Amino acid sequence: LKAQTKTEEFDAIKIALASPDMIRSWSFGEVKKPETINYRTFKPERDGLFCARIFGPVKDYECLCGKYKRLKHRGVICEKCGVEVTQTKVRRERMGHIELASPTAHIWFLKSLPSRIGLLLDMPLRDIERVLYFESYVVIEGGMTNLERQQILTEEQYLDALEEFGDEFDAKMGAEAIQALLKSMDLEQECEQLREELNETNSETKRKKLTKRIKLLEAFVQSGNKPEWMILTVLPVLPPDLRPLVPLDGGRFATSDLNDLYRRVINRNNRLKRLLDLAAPDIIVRNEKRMLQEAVDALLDNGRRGRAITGSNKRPLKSLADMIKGKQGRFRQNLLGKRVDYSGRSVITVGPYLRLHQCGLPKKMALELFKPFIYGKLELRGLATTIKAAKKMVEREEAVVWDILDEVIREHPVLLNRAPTLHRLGIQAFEPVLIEGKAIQLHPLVCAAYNADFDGDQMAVHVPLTLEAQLEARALMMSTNNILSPANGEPIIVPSQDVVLGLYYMTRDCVNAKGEGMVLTGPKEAERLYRSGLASLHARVKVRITEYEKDANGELVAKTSLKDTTVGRAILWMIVPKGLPYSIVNQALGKKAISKMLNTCYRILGLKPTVIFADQIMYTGFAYAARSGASVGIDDMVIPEKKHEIISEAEAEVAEIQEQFQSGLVTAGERYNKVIDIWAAANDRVSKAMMDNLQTETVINRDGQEEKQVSFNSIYMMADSGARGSAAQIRQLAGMRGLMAKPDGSIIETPITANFREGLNVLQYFISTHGARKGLADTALKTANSGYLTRRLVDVAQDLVVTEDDCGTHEGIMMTPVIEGGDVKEPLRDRVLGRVTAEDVLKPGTADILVPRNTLLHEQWCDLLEENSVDAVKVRSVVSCDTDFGVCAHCYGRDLARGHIINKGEAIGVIAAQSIGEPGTQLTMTGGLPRVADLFEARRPKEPAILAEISGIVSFGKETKGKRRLVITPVDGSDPYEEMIPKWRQLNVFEGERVERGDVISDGPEAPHDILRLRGVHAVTRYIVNEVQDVYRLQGVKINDKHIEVIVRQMLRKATIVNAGSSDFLEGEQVEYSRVKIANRELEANGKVGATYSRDLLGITKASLATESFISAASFQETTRVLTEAAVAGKRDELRGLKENVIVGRLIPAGTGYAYHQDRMRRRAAG
């Protein structure tokens, strides 16, 4: 079968050095002149940087001279001015070239930090520059005389050396010399030479540096690049329209900076060509060559020299490297990120009438957005003769179009987005609902997922055009398909504030109210009692209820009983579908219970019942809350009657301690701390006085004498329900507020004795100011810290995707409850939920298989384990997954917005990184958010501990030399370990004990590098997750341990060989590659040997550095260095990753595209 020639759909990419002949291949002409346009008739001057002959017609399908103006004429080259008449588009495509008189060095291979040309020749950089500026002569191919091949001479020395040997020795200077060296260099011969020397001299100093060079050289050899090409003979010119001269208003012109640069290189080049035929003296043509060299450099990458400035403008002219480069990497892919058609935005509002699957869309917005669709539907039914008439119709806004828009709108989701998109719920698909008015209406339940308040925040809309985009939006991005956080399995659609105050006020009970004691047949006549004004919403009542339990085998049982309840809970029962028990609604229904209600409904009846349920809860929540007439008055905030007395007593204490300091009974420092404590203690007293009074002091009577219940006071209901406010914030309203802190951080020993219900005087407010401003500053900065963190995270993960089904490893990590020092800071059930078992678990007794090998532990399974006393469970994790280049679905877990096991192909790295980064706003400024980063950066603490390197008996040897050596001695194994530990650090280690490898030989923090090395992989991963999770959980943030585990797996991706037989001994390399390769030896070729490696721990930012794809690396890394370092090796990017596929603009090799890439990836390496 024939291969191909013309444009097929390409896979992979290649990058390499460009030969002068290769550059000529692209070039359709030589730019011989600095001229641009004619200066009167604005036509391009032949043949200059803008040329119709070299590049293309100024206007579509028309010859420049004007002889051939006809659209028929296409392959025609005008006889007057050779211009083949074709679309002006080719002026954006066709390249050109310039033939340089003298060779010229490429600054990138000269000036990228490891000068490539320098170490290719094993020659210093400063010397090469010394040869380039004609500041000395360098030898080439010295022959047998006096001189080294690479030796450098000065003017007189070259002369002195020349009188003795005229010929059979050669030396040049400048660029031509360097080019001659590169051409003369034989890598093959040099490679052999380098191979012997490694073996001959044995020294680490020697062979360390030695080995680095030989692999590099042979890489360049196998690459196919010829060294000479680092020196430019021919220089390609970029198509004119990519650096346009386009006119402006008022007749002025504007142009890219490259022209000024290109023009210069041309002038100088041309001048030099002239100076050769005039036989100018050396001193000039030399100067002209340096000037040309500088000029080319300024063109390619400006700023590696003097930084030439554009004409008449101080600001330096932008060069080609700066066009690619930026902040950060490429502008193209950097945020932001390309503008997109079919979009819009406006201020957003509520719309509680909406169902959860839809959103209010302004009439005009939908009109302008679906404009092409409207045209097509309008001319599909024949209401418009043609598209033009259709254009006029919607432009006329004839009334008839509105019905047509409801058709084109109906089943057609739109994407809604908020400004800081953090997790994937930052974008969700909705069904359009036509709205008069310019505001976007957004279903209330989603406002939590977006973090969208209504304080004037704006949202952006996107229309999913292609059929595949409509179905992606509906089956993935739809609102109803994500009700559960992917970060933690808990529902994110939990009713927010107004609704839960409604349901809290609804299911609540007072002691004596209308309808107290009566009984009703069912919720129907309960509402009939209430709505008619007979019964109070909260009164204790028995009513007949029918609950349901599906406790049969997939089958619903029914049960009826007399439940003791209130009227509101009875009324509320009408919404609860089928198999939920009345127990869930028989309580007071705070914000905490109302989410777990939704959670259980999902985990039992599935999705569909849960969605419509959520809707109903919101509707009834708002409604009854409106009935409740909740408000806030100034008398709703009750100050304790005992406040002034408490302040005075604490005011007496400071005067006790003060008398003690004047009389010297207590020290000054002791004074500060003493007073601060009593004032602090005072605050707790006032807080817990007003809390008691505020909470229950409503004291009311039913028929009998008195009694007292939880208050119905307005502000309390908000805080108890979970609606808004918290005991801390309330404490500032009624009780005194806090002790503020001066900028210094030293909390002032005279707190704020007033509160907001009273007035704050001048001093108290002024002192309050610092806390606010530092708060805003801290948060506004904590905003910045979070973003960078998610960035580093997604860069190191990203390309990680679920690929295989079951790697089929029994391996996994042991899950126990966290038990931090007290009682159960986190249960076992949350830690293990939704994960898969490593091996079958036994009861406390045995011959009992509870869970059979690998089984997803769902709610029943976790409860069956909890029924029993089960204390410990080993679980497959993404860190242990045997699948290479991805995660096996079994090792990850089920978690998603759906409860089912994770699908094949979901990109989990991103959702893991996003889930970890998003909550980061709430962390503090040890502790806080920077503490998390230290964990993920693997950073070694300042004064770490040291762990026993190897098991066996240890002892001390030699004596204080600034380090006192420690000798460990295994019984059987070799003794030789003696480490020099500074002894001025307090030891722990019993001097006379045998130490298990990895014990604490001193105190202080430990480097996670050790834990991986000494204790093992599972130990360090357990260490990271528990420490980082300590930070979040301390703030009340729920992040499943899974996500942290995947980041960890990426930290240790690389390993360092120990044994040999096929690989590089000391090479750091992917354990993916090694593991697939040692399987290729265990039964393949030679056993050979081998090889044993050692897993390594890389910080997140360092591990993301290594990426196979250079297009990906060129994005977020330093672009110049990436391209150079890649261009020399002739590295071939196969795509395969995410980052790169986004760049080239094809299907992401994940999700919907994962089927595609898979189908294509296999087509490769076949026939």
Partner 1 sequence: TTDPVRMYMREMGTVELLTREGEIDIAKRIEDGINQVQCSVAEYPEAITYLLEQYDRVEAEEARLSDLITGFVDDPELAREKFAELRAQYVVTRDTIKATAQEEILKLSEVFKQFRLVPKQFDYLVNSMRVMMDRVRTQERLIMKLCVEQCKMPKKNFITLFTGNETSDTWFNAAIAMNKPWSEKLHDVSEEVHRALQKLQQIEEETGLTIEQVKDINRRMSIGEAKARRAKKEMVEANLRLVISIAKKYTNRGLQFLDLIQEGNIGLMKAVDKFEYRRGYKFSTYATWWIRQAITRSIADQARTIRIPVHMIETINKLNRISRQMLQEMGREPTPEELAERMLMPEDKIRKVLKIAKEPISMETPIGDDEDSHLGDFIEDTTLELPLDSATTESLRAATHDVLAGLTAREAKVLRMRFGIDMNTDYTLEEVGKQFDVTRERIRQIEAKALRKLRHPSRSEVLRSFLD
Q: Which residues bind Zn ion (CB under 5 A)?
A: 63-65, 67, 78, 80-81, 807, 881-882, 888, 891
Place of tokens 């004032």: 679
In what side-by-side order are the strands of the sheet with 813-815? 813-815, 873-876, 836-837
User: Is the Cβ of residue 452 or residue 1028 nearer to Mg ion in the bound state?
Assistant: 452
In what side-by-side order are the strands of the sheet with 978-981? 978-981, 964-969, 952-956, 994-995
Question: Least distance from C-beta 252 to partner 1, angstroms?
Answer: 5
φ and ψ of 5, to 5 deg: -150, -55
User: Is the Cβ of residue 37 or residue 187 nearer to partner 1 in the bound state?
Assistant: 37
Residues 72-131 that bind partner 1 (CB under 8 A): 72, 88, 129
Give the whole-angstrom CA distance, residue 906 versus residue 861.
25
- Which listed option, Mg ion, Zn ion, partner 1, none, makes contact with residue 260 (CB within 5 to 8 Å by class)? partner 1
Applying CB under 8 A, does 521 fall inside the site for partner 1?
no
- Which listed option, partner 1, Zn ion, Mg ion, none, makes contact with residue 67 (CB within 5 to 8 Å by class)? Zn ion
Nearest by Cα to 53 from 79, 71, 34, 23? 79
- Which listed option, partner 1, Zn ion, Mg ion, none, makes contact with residue 455 (CB within 5 to 8 Å by class)? Mg ion
Give the whole-angstrom CA distance, residue 299 versus residue 100.
14
- Which listed option, Zn ion, partner 1, Mg ion, none, makes contact with residue 1080 (CB within 5 to 8 Å by class)? none
- Measured CA to CA in angstroms, residue 74 lies from 43, 68, 296 at distances of 21, 9, 36
Question: Given the rule CB under 5 A, which residues bind Mg ion?
Answer: 453, 455, 457
User: Is the Cβ of residue 36 or residue 1029 nearer to partner 1 in the bound state?
Assistant: 36
Question: Least distance from C-beta 125 to partner 1, angstroms?
Answer: 12
Applying CB under 8 A, does 66 fall inside the site for partner 1?
no
User: Is the Cβ of residue 807 or residue 828 nearer to Zn ion in the bound state?
Assistant: 807
Q: 191 among the known binding-site residues?
A: no
Question: Least distance from C-beta 70 to Zn ion, angstroms?
Answer: 12
Exactly one of 76, 219, 221, 389 binds partner 1 (CB under 8 A); which one? Answer: 389
Neighbours of 613 (CB within 10 A): 19
- Measured CA to CA in angstroms, residue 597 lies from 495, 721, 1105 at distances of 11, 14, 45
User: Is the Cβ of residue 314 or residue 1162 nearer to partner 1 in the bound state?
Assistant: 314
- Measured CA to CA in angstroms, residue 395 lies from 13, 174, 250, 389, 799 at distances of 47, 69, 32, 10, 46
User: Is the Cβ of residue 692 or residue 840 nearer to Zn ion in the bound state?
Assistant: 840
Applying CB under 8 A, does 246 fall inside the site for partner 1?
yes
User: Is the Cβ of residue 457 or residue 549 nearer to Mg ion in the bound state?
Assistant: 457
- Which listed option, Mg ion, partner 1, Zn ion, none, makes contact with residue 453 (CB within 5 to 8 Å by class)? Mg ion
Question: Least distance from C-beta 295 to partner 1, angstroms?
Answer: 9
Question: Least distance from C-beta 772 to partner 1, angstroms?
Answer: 28
Give the whole-angstrom CA distance, residue 883 versus residue 811.
12
Give the whole-angstrom CA distance, residue 162 versus residue 165.
5
- Which listed option, Zn ion, partner 1, Mg ion, none, makes contact with residue 457 (CB within 5 to 8 Å by class)? Mg ion
Give the whole-angstrom CA distance, residue 1134 versus residue 1151.
19
Number of amino acids touching partner 1 (CB under 8 A): 71
- Which listed option, Mg ion, partner 1, Zn ion, none, makes contact with residue 1167 (CB within 5 to 8 Å by class)? none
Q: Are 1108 and 1137 in contact (CB under 8 A)?
A: yes
User: Is the Cβ of residue 179 or residue 302 nearer to partner 1 in the bound state?
Assistant: 302
Give the whole-angstrom CA distance, residue 859 versus residue 833.
7
User: Is the Cβ of residue 144 or residue 336 nearer to partner 1 in the bound state?
Assistant: 336
Residues 133-172 that bind partner 1 (CB under 8 A): 133-135
Q: 862 among the known binding-site residues?
A: no
Helix axes 929-936, 762-796, angle to 10 degrees: 20
- Binding segment for partner 1 (CB under 8 A), chosen from 77-85, 193-201, 268-276, 357-365, is 268-276
Give the helix/strand (H/E) hosting 965.
strand 964-969
Applying CB under 8 A, does 381 fall inside the site for partner 1?
no
Question: Least distance from C-beta 813 to Zn ion, angstroms?
Answer: 12
Neighbours of 135 (CB within 10 A): 15
Question: Least distance from C-beta 1148 to partner 1, angstroms?
Answer: 26
- Measured CA to CA in angstroms, residue 275 lies from 297, 594, 1095 at distances of 21, 88, 62
User: Is the Cβ of residue 372 or residue 609 nearer to partner 1 in the bound state?
Assistant: 372
Exactly one of 84, 260, 472, 1041 binds partner 1 (CB under 8 A); which one? Answer: 260
Applying CB under 8 A, does 313 fall inside the site for partner 1?
yes
Nearest by Cα to 110 from 90, 126, 93, 97? 126
- Which listed option, Zn ion, Mg ion, partner 1, none, makes contact with residue 807 (CB within 5 to 8 Å by class)? Zn ion
Query: x/- binding map, residues 3-42, to partner 1, per CB under 8 A?
Result: -------------------------------xxxx-xx--
Give the whole-angstrom CA distance, residue 667 versus residue 662.
9
Question: Least distance from C-beta 375 to partner 1, angstroms?
Answer: 8
Exactly one of 47, 84, 228, 288 binds partner 1 (CB under 8 A); which one? Answer: 288
Give the whole-angstrom CA distance, residue 36 versus residue 263.
9
Q: 457 among the known binding-site residues?
A: yes
- Which listed option, Zn ion, Mg ion, partner 1, none, makes contact with residue 388 (CB within 5 to 8 Å by class)? partner 1
Exactly one of 149, 391, 825, 1088 binds partner 1 (CB under 8 A); which one? Answer: 391
- The identity of residue 1101, as a single letter, is T
Question: Least distance from C-beta 361 to partner 1, angstroms?
Answer: 22
- Which listed option, Zn ion, Mg ion, partner 1, none, makes contact with residue 63 (CB within 5 to 8 Å by class)? Zn ion
- The identity of residue 876, as a single letter, is R
Residues 602-641 that bind partner 1 (CB under 8 A): none
Applying CB under 8 A, does 353 fall inside the site for partner 1?
no
User: Is the Cβ of residue 451 or residue 750 nearer to Mg ion in the bound state?
Assistant: 451
User: Is the Cβ of residue 208 or residue 274 nearer to partner 1 in the bound state?
Assistant: 274
Buried/exposed 1003-1012: b ≥16 CB within 10 Å, e otherwise: eeebbbbbbb
- The identity of residue 827, as a single letter, is P
- Residues in the chain followed by a break, C to N above 2.5 angstroms: 925
Q: 455 among the known binding-site residues?
A: yes
Applying CB under 8 A, does 281 fall inside the site for partner 1?
yes
What lies within 8 Å, CB to CB, of 212 at 6+ separation is none
**Burial bucket for residue 132 (CB in 10 Å: 0-12, 13-18, 19+):** buried
Give the whole-angstrom CA distance, residue 193 versus residue 207.
13
- Binding segment for partner 1 (CB under 8 A), chosen from 239-247, 802-810, 904-912, 1115-1123, is 239-247
- Measured CA to CA in angstroms, residue 774 lies from 301, 742, 771, 921, 1144 at distances of 43, 10, 5, 15, 44
Give the whole-angstrom CA distance, residue 733 versus residue 730.
5
Tokens of 928: 């806080």
User: Is the Cβ of residue 650 or residue 1046 nearer to Zn ion in the bound state?
Assistant: 1046
Applying CB under 8 A, does 307 fall inside the site for partner 1?
no
Applying CB under 8 A, does 310 fall inside the site for partner 1?
yes
Q: 807 among the known binding-site residues?
A: yes
Neighbours of 670 (CB within 10 A): 13
Q: 65 among the known binding-site residues?
A: yes
User: Is the Cβ of residue 228 or residue 260 nearer to partner 1 in the bound state?
Assistant: 260
Q: State the binding site.
A: 63, 65, 78, 81, 453, 455, 457, 807, 881, 888, 891
Q: State the binding site for Zn(2+).
A: 63, 65, 78, 81, 807, 881, 888, 891
Q: State the binding site for Mg(2+).
A: 453, 455, 457
